[PDB]
């Protein structure tokens, strides 16, 4: 029983954190094999994040332009490159800890594990979502750059974030592991407006199942409503239309607890309608959007109360 | 900027983690050097855990009673032994991964992360709060038993919580890593209460303090307060009385933001005797009490807004 925002074990990315210093500026890089990935920023100076030139700042820079460090072991860079936004360093090492592991761009509204590093060094962990604007809502400092999200699936790590920067707004901004932005962002030192972020609707309903299979009950109710009318509410309180492939990713929650989605549908249109009237569900006072149902799944009982 | 729920980073505990079997009862255990902490209800059978005596049981096992898996490798117990409510196994190899660590029992109202793990395999980390009853509001299933909940302060692990229970609420109970329950409970398939839960008013105040260090601002105001004024709305709303230590220890937090603690107390008491009117602070619609003064410092950043 319970239901708390987890991550995956960071261990096997713990193994693969490194420090990238390039002049003055250092962050974090990802070592995988005998390579390390980290933001290509790296190479800019102040004066150069106003309105970058990367393909100049590179050429001007060699391999001992670059300090990598695995701890208090220095790595010998034998190599740089540039793939979009991420810098590739060879190094003369593999990494002997190198899991398995795949680079996978992930869709807005799923999950992933970011492991918080500053100087190479591992510092916290938690869960984020990839808002439908193509933003997390993450908590990083000053040197966090570099640091890499990613999810756990049988001893396979598939890298999906590396983390490039904060926004004016507070939220944060990246690329995938191809060094691709997600949204529309770009590594200069500018100000840039994410779009009008929504509430992701799918996930809503997968963490009202996680209530029920805790025991959580008290917002249910015997009305039904259909797939139009229920978008019609959507629409009206910014959250995202609902399809019939998100009702068949809830299939296996809906025949868990023996509620049909659309059944749930209604409750959910009643709590936007009304509030929760000071009652809490899951512990939360407000209508929860960063659980997957492949998230609720995975930490939830099987069998329902 | 931002302020998530944060674990310590998993890795150094996950390589303790081994699996303990003993006839067809499987739970976790916790390999440092050449010893296995586990929960000793490992040796109860179902009729057993009604009403065990483990003293009793133990003496009628053998050291080739107890199957001792770190992952496929099997472990050859040469030894065992019963500390209150934790079973020591002493095993032929000292695990070559064993961190620098303590065992300390934590106090109620701190917080520690939690490596929930089944079969001896890690699953996902997250964090917990001690709560004033003695209990933790954990996400745990069957199989969860002998998860560890830590801290981790310049690479010495503090283990402070092994998991061997949930109680009818569907909160947890464990011991403290001597195999002392926290609280008043005992190793016993039976059904036991807690006391009385309340909330932990100092780490409310310091989360108001990250909300401020944050920019969230709605919630202050010109008023200011007495120690003795406020500990008599605490006892309405069921906090726990402040004291002066509990203001020292929010120095830091007080000073960064140049909001004294006792104005911050005029906050939080308009907060308790109106809500939030539909607001939020850093992403919760209610007053979060699971962040430490300590949490708050080590996550938010340095400089005020
Ligand atoms: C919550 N509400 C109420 C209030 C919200 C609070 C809002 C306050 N937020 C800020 O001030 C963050 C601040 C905003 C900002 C952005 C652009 C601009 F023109 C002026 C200001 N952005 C940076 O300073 C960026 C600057 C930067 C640099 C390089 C590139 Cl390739 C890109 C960029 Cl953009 N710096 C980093 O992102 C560093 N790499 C990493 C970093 C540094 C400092 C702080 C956090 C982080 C992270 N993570
Ligand atoms: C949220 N609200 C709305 C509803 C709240 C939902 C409440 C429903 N909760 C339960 O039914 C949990 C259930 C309660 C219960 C407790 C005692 C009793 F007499 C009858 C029932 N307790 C167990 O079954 C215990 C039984 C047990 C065994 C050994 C010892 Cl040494 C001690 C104990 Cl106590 N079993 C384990 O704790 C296992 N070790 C691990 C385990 C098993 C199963 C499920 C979770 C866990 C964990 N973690």
């Given at each position: 029983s319970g239901f708390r925002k987890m991550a995956f074990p960071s261990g096997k990315v713990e193994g693969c954190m490194v420090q990238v210093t390039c002049g003055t500026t250092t962050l974090n890089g990802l070592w995988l094999d005998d390579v390390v990935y980290c933001?290509?920023?790296?190479?800019?100076?102040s004066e150069d994040?106003?309105?970058?030139?990367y393909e100049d700042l590179l050429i001007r820079?060699?391999?001992?332009?670059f300090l990598v460090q695995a701890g208090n072991v220095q790595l010998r860079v034998i190599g740089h490159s540039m793939q979009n936004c991420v810098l590739k360093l060879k190094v003369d090492?593999?990494?002997?800890?190198?899991?398995?592991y795949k680079f996978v761009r992930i869709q807005p509204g799923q999950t992933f594990s970011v492991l918080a590093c500053y100087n190479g060094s591992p510092s916290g962990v938690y869960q984020c979502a990839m808002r439908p604007n193509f933003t997390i809502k993450g908590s990083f400092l000053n040197g966090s750059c570099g640091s890499v999200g990613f999810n756990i699936d049988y001893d396979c790590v598939s890298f999906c974030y590396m983390h490039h920067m904060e926004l004016p707004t507070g939220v944060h901004a990246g690329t995938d592991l191809e060094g691709?932005?997600?949204?529309?962002?770009?590594?200069?030192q500018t100000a840039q407006a994410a779009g009008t972020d929504t509430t992701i609707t799918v996930n809503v309903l997968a963490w009202l199942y996680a209530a029920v299979i805790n025991?959580?009950?008290?917002?249910?109710?015997?009305f039904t409503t259909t797939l139009n009318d229920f978008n019609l509410v959507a629409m009206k309180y910014n959250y995202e239309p609902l399809t019939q492939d998100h009702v068949d990713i809830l299939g296996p929650l809906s025949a868990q607890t023996g509620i049909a989605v659309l059944d749930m549908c209604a409750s959910l249109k009643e709590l936007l309608q009304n509030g929760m009237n000071g009652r809490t569900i899951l512990g939360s006072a407000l209508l929860e959007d960063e659980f997957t149902p492949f998230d609720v799944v995975r930490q939830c009982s099987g069998v329902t109360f």
């Open positions: 933001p290509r920023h790296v190479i800019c100076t994040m106003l309105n970058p030139n820079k060699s391999n001992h332009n090492t593999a990494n002997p800890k190198t899991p398995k691709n932005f997600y949204g529309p962002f770009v590594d200069r025991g959580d009950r008290w917002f249910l109710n015997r």
